[PDB]
Design a protein around this ligand. Sequence first.
Ligand SMILES: CN[C@@H]1[C@@H](O[C@H]2O[C@H](CO)[C@@H](N)[C@H](O)[C@H]2O)O[C@H]2C[C@@H](N)[C@@H](O[C@H]3[C@H](O)[C@@H](O)[C@H](N)C[C@@H]3N)O[C@@H]2[C@@H]1O
Ligand SMILES: CN[C@@H]1[C@@H](O[C@H]2O[C@H](CO)[C@@H](N)[C@H](O)[C@H]2O)O[C@H]2C[C@@H](N)[C@@H](O[C@H]3[C@H](O)[C@@H](O)[C@H](N)C[C@@H]3N)O[C@@H]2[C@@H]1O
Ligand SMILES: [Mg+2]
Ligand SMILES: [Mg+2]
Ligand SMILES: [Mg+2]
Ligand SMILES: [Mg+2]
Ligand SMILES: [Mg+2]
Ligand SMILES: [Mg+2]
Ligand SMILES: [Mg+2]
Ligand SMILES: [Mg+2]
Ligand SMILES: [Mg+2]
Ligand SMILES: [Mg+2]
Ligand SMILES: [Mg+2]
Ligand SMILES: [Mg+2]
Ligand SMILES: [Mg+2]
Ligand SMILES: [Mg+2]
Ligand SMILES: [Mg+2]
Ligand SMILES: [Mg+2]
Ligand SMILES: [Mg+2]
Ligand SMILES: [Mg+2]
Lengths: 65, 65, 116, 151
Amino acid sequence: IKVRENEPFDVALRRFKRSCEKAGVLAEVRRREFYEKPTTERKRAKASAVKRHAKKLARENARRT
Amino acid sequence: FCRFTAEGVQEIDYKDIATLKNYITESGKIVPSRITGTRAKYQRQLARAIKRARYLSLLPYTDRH
Amino acid sequence: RKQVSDGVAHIHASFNNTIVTITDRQGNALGWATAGGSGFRGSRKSTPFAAQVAAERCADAVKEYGIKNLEVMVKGPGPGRESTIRALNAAGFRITNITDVTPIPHNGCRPPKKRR
Amino acid sequence: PRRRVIGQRKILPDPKFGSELLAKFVNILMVDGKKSTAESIVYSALETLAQRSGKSELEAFEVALENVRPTVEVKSRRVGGSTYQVPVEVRPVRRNALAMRWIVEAARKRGDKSMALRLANELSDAAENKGTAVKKREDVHRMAEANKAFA
RNA sequence: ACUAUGUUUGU
RNA sequence: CUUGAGUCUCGUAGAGGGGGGUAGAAUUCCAGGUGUAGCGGUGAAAUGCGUAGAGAUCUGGAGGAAUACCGGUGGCGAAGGCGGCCCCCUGGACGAAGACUGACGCUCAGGUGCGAAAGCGUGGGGAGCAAACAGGAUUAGAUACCCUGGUAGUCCACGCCGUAAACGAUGUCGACUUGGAGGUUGUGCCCUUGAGGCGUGGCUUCCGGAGCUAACGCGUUAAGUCGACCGCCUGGGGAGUACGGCCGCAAGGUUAAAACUCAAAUGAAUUGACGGGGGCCCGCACAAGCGGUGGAGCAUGUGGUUUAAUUCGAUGCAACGCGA
Ligand SMILES: CN[C@@H]1[C@@H](O[C@H]2O[C@H](CO)[C@@H](N)[C@H](O)[C@H]2O)O[C@H]2C[C@@H](N)[C@@H](O[C@H]3[C@H](O)[C@@H](O)[C@H](N)C[C@@H]3N)O[C@@H]2[C@@H]1O
Ligand SMILES: CN[C@@H]1[C@@H](O[C@H]2O[C@H](CO)[C@@H](N)[C@H](O)[C@H]2O)O[C@H]2C[C@@H](N)[C@@H](O[C@H]3[C@H](O)[C@@H](O)[C@H](N)C[C@@H]3N)O[C@@H]2[C@@H]1O
Ligand SMILES: [Mg+2]
Ligand SMILES: [Mg+2]
Ligand SMILES: [Mg+2]
Ligand SMILES: [Mg+2]
Ligand SMILES: [Mg+2]
Ligand SMILES: [Mg+2]
Ligand SMILES: [Mg+2]
Ligand SMILES: [Mg+2]
Ligand SMILES: [Mg+2]
Ligand SMILES: [Mg+2]
Ligand SMILES: [Mg+2]
Ligand SMILES: [Mg+2]
Ligand SMILES: [Mg+2]
Ligand SMILES: [Mg+2]
Ligand SMILES: [Mg+2]
Ligand SMILES: [Mg+2]
Ligand SMILES: [Mg+2]
Ligand SMILES: [Mg+2]
């Protein structure tokens, strides 16, 4: 986040824009803009885990490509 | 893979700041075990040690103190 | 109008407006501009272009202090958190370091309710 | 349209001056298929433009077009329920099309004795940037400058 | 951004 | 008698509970410095705040609440629930090897206890949020959604209440019946060569076999095959209502009908249709243009009004220079 910049400004702005993205500060802020009921938080986490349960072995199909 | 289970540390010491640093991000956030490869048992020990080190001011809570 | 060579650029970027404030490195403000102050009322206030114009309008009116090096402390979400920095560098400032100073609680106060 | 991409219709150039660009301007000014009537109008108007300016017909016409050619235009676009005017750079072929159309509508409006006089007068005022067509291009540039916050 | 409604009864 | 059940020895994991203390971030407020005309908010606005100095920024201080990351279809708990860190008190579970007791077990009407949130009482506390309420909007109206505020409450202690889609909509206990892929937590052996291999437990997630099921689906954590005991159902409404009893400060809870009325009410799945659902692709559908209509006069056709008759028919697109 605290990005000291090397000679080129543009590559520094990329480094800062990347450093923030890995820190997830924008995602942090968007989530804390409003209160989420613990029902919603648990429901969202469970739904994310279900979709995160993506079987990568389902690519065993011809499809005639 | 998990370094702690590799060396059989068997108790993660909060006073070992050197190895504690490579488990916190640049902002001081604790890195998830799914990134460092640490086992669940040691990740819980790791989090407790980091929080203890934060309290003793051996590690920063954030990068913006 | 005392000369300051090292300034800090505080970009208060929000979803509705962008506020740019140039301070010295002790916190004392020297000049400021906002997207809503540079024209751009309503929907145009919350665009990255308006924030860039605010950075220019803030780079000028602080030029008299003769700042050449700027720390950047950007805070908050919003379209004007990179356009302001780019405009600041385009205005002839040597950016020294860029910091995201967005206030992140540690599960503190309860946020307002979700809008329906 | 949605799928079918158009190959441009070819325009035969004007007889007197052999200009592709001028032939298009005759088409813009043509009414009711009377291309002969339109051809005389712009041929008459061009030669009074030549005499009252000092350059040739093509050079005088080019000067007027340059002062009326737009560079950026707005288009009402949508994201959600937005409806903002979005400034977009005009492609070079549309720049000439817009300039010719703006000159012709301005010439029709400015009441004189003849259309050739109307066209010659508006073409001259465009050369010195006083025409209503120049006014409209200023409005377009002004309107696209206000909404430069969108891209 | 944000409109509401659609008379009763058959083959 | 030892297999069920229980006790002891060693160890393990855990947001399990109760009581104290403490840390950092952030919000708000208070005081001050710099500084200046906006800030804030929305779809757009306005209410609101601001030259009485806002917002922004910096310093100091107060206070309350909650504990970012870790964090995980991870863990613990009978359930409700429980996550910053530290200490004190304390419950349960599990594993290895033995020893011990010797059906001491299972279930459980009444009974008793615990039991989210809201709510209630007493006393504190009160940052943020926020029923009520007020204002601004929106709208035909808007007792709403949105905005600006804002009281109770949310917090603490004690005492009530005793209800939730308190849900796995799946009572408890026990036995048996193919597999696969994980997670968590022990433990035995072996090449531990290093997080490994082969077993063996506990708890967990997904898929799936037989079987079952109306189907969906469940499928060794069964909704399969059985046994024990308990609870409950008997069409939809009326009605979880009335009355009565009990409980409660109250709110109300609990137990719990009848008359009357209907021929249904329901579940799952199927085809279609529809969606201010999603994806993809088209069309003078938009877009880009050109020329019109709606205004005038007339022609013509329709309504209507009039008439003795103004013949009949055509009426959204797909009737109205239509049958003609
Ligand atoms: C591991 N068994 C699961 C069970 O676990 C529950 O009982 C366990 C007892 O130990 C608990 N450990 C656990 O925490 C608790 O959740 O909950 C049920 C809930 C039921 N609606 C159904 O959902 C299925 C849906 O019916 C179906 O439509 C969908 N496709 C998939 C769902 N699993 O199947 C699961 C499944 O049988
Ligand atoms: C050898 N690999 C593993 C072993 O690790 C350890 O094994 C030895 C101790 O025995 C040590 N010497 C060795 O250093 C150490 O690596 O721990 C066991 C723990 C056991 N509950 C089971 O869990 C799995 C089960 O299959 C099941 O519980 C679940 N589905 C998935 C679990 N991973 O399988 C693993 C697996 O056998
Ligand atoms: Mg009505
Ligand atoms: Mg004996
Ligand atoms: Mg009972
Ligand atoms: Mg109780
Ligand atoms: Mg409560
Ligand atoms: Mg109270
Ligand atoms: Mg409100
Ligand atoms: Mg109930
Ligand atoms: Mg629950
Ligand atoms: Mg039930
Ligand atoms: Mg299954
Ligand atoms: Mg069943
Ligand atoms: Mg009752
Ligand atoms: Mg169009
Ligand atoms: Mg007409
Ligand atoms: Mg008329
Ligand atoms: Mg007729
Ligand atoms: Mg008829």
